[PDB]
Every structure is written in structure tokens, then in C-alpha cells.
Design a binder for this molecule. Structure first.
Ligand SMILES: O=P(O)(O)O[C@H]1[C@H](O)[C@@H](OP(=O)(O)O)[C@@H](OP(=O)(O)O)[C@@H](OP(=O)(O)O)[C@H]1O
Length: 136
């Protein structure tokens, strides 16, 4: 299934899913504020890896846009109503920030609903906790 999924993503960069991941933990679409732009992206959280893609319009389903090793990923909650440097003045709701150390930058994610934000934050915590746990 990892190899299937990757085959549906054009312009892949870097190591293959089957080589460094075992499990798609969560997928969903989110608004991303980065470098002053707002764009919708499909996000995929795997063990060890966060990937985001542009979904192809129907006018292969995805175009690869970014990946982050979760072991160097930092995450920060954003309180609703925040409008600041990283949101470039946009009023954030249902949001959080992700640190991409590989490019020395943060970007902001926003989910459609509060429940969806909570799903993402909990999944990121669980990925971290499993990764740090003693293995069986
Ligand atoms: O689409 P354009 O108009 O070219 O602007 C791009 C997109 O916002 C990118 O987001 P995405 O990768 O999702 O398509 C991207 O990097 P991030 O992935 O780091 O957010 C760029 O940030 P910089 O590379 O810092 O310029 C920004 O310049």
C-alpha cells in the first residue's frame, strides 16, 4: 500500500516510503500558510515522515511538494485569533505551526474543524511517542 500510494504521487523526491515508513497514520487536506502564501495541500503523516502534496485538478492524483523527517519536526499550537509573522497577518483558526528545520522555516497548518485539528495534533504526538518508545 505504501508503494501504491507513492506511485500515485508525481515528482517524488528522496527515499522511498517502503524504505523508511511502515504505516500511513493519517491523511487529510489542510490550508498551509508559508512564505506569505496560502495554498491547500494534501498532508500524509507516516511513521518517521510527514509529506505534503498538491492535489491535481481533474480539468496519478498528487504532485509531491514537501517532506519532513518527523524526528527533526517541531510543532506548536496556535490559538484561534492569532494573526502574526508566520500567518503573515492572516487570522488563524483551527491552526498550528510546523518547523521544517531543513529549510530553517516554519509554516502554518489550518484544518476545517476543531475536531480535525485535534486529530492531527494527537496523531503527531502518537507518532513521536511510538518512535521514542522501546520496541518489541
Ligand atoms: O507556489 P509559489 O508561488 O512558488 O510559492 C511557494 C509555495 O508557497 C511553496 O509551498 P508548497 O511547497 O506547498 O508548494 C514553497 O515552500 P514550502 O513547501 O516550504 O512551504 C515556497 O516557499 P519557499 O521555498 O520558502 O520559497 C513558496 O515560495
Amino acid at each position: 500500500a505504501l508503494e501504491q500510494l507513492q506511485s500515485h504521487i508525481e515528482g517524488w523526491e528522496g527515499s522511498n516510503l517502503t524504505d523508511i515508513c511502515t504505516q500511513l497514520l493519517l491523511q487529510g487536506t489542510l490550508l498551509k500558510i508559508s512564505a506569505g502564501n496560502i495554498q491547500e495541500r494534501a498532508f500524509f503523516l507516516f511513521d518517521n515522515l510527514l509529506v505534503y502534496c498538491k492535489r491535481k485538478s481533474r480539468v496519478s492524483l498528487y504532485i509531491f511538494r514537501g517532506r519532513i523527517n518527523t524526528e527533526v519536526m517541531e510543532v506548536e499550537n496556535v490559538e484561534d485569533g492569532t494573526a502574526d509573522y508566520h500567518s503573515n497577518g492572516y487570522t488563524v483558526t483551527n491552526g498550528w505551526k510546523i518547523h521544517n528545520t531543513a529549510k530553517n522555516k516554519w509554516f502554518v497548518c489550518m484544518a476545517k474543524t476543531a475536531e480535525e485539528k485535534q486529530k492531527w495534533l494527537d496523531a503527531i504526538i502518537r507518532e513521536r511517542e511510538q518512535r521514542e518508545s522501546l520496541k518489541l
